[model samples]
Target: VQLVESGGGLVQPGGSLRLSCAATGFTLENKAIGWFRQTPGSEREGVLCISKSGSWTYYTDSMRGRFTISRDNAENTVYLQMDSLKPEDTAVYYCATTTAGGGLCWDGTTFSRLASSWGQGTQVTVS
Candidate 1:
């Protein structure tokens, strides 16, 4: 399984961001996917999580107000769209999923929180 991220490299504050993740080598229908962000000198933070069944989306409190997550089964892709972008939002965004073992989380309850396969990441510079 593999994940590939794509989006604009730079965005200014008050602008919007649209990022995508393409999954390959496997079907994404009943799988787990997570979106995360890592800023310079900071730890990775959870942006959101998508359920395997694609029926639910869970966003971290930090992102609940400005971010939306969705998936396209036809393309095996996931998306992260953001509005009201700010300079502090600059970071490397990643899409991730487990290669095996962990089951999909449909109800936002999961103790297994890790991904074995992750996208190289899309860098969004909001300034």
Candidate 2:
């Protein structure tokens, strides 16, 4: 199976960030894709929706527009978009998936807590 994913970080507060992740193992429609954040040794938290074909997206009020998630079925890649960035948003972003859909929650439910793949850690810092 071939699993491909990518992402990056921005250091300027109010800056923008772009990243992507793709897979060749399965179809995106049949898979549930998601993004997560983990501060070095801290527990991971759901960030946005990566591949939400028929389910609700997972995100918080504070990160509604500052962050976004998308997927390209034609390219089989997942994308993350961020704007008006802040220092507090700096963290290692990763791509994930589960058997079911995901909703707004602090700790992703076990029913949908499977990290299938991850991108290079993006570090967004404010100077």
Candidate 3:
């Protein structure tokens, strides 16, 4: 399973950007696609996630607005769209496959999605 992310540039503040992640050797239709980011002096954070069936999407509190996640089954690609960008938004973005049942925390009552594979990561700089 390989994931390749594309589309990163020196975008101006308030500009928009669309990041793409293409998957190979796997079936995206049966797995969830997730977007993660690691900013300077910060740990990696999950930004957005889209379910395999496209029936649900999840986002972190900081990314509630101005961020969207979508996918194209035909191309086996997932996309993350950011609007009204800011300098704080600059980071190394990664795409990964999220699988259920296994995560950092796993309990009978609580479950978390786990990342099986990650992309090489795309760096986006907002200047």
Q: How accurate is candidate 2 locally (lDDT)?
A: 0.62
Give the range where candidate 2 is weakest over 10 consecutive residues by summed lDDT: 103-112
Residue ranges of candidate 1 with Cα displaced over 4 Å: 55-59, 100-113
Pairs of residues clashing in candidate 2: 4-22, 5-21, 6-20, 11-125
- In candidate 2, position 117 carries an lDDT of 45
Q: lDDT for each of the candidates?
A: 0.75, 0.62, 0.75
Question: Residues 1-127, candidate 3, lDDT per residue (tens digit)?
Answer: 7999998888899999999999888767677777778876977777777765574345467747888877788998888999999999889998777555422222211222356687999999999
Clashes of each: 0, 4, 0
State every prediction's TM-score relative to the real structure. 0.84, 0.75, 0.83
| CA displacement after TM-score superposition, residue 41 of candidate 1 (Å) | 2.8
lDDT of 1: 0.75
Residue-by-residue lDDT tens digits, candidate 2, 1-127? 4455555744678778777767767766566666667787788777766445444466655758677766678987767787888788877777665543442222354423545444545555555
lDDT accuracy of residue 95 in candidate 2: 68
Candidate 3 wrongly placed segments (more than 4 Å): 99-113
What's the residue-level lDDT of 6 in candidate 3? 95
Better of 1 and 2 by TM-score: 1
Q: What lDDT tens digits, residue by residue, belong to model 1 across residues 31-51?
A: 778877887797777777777
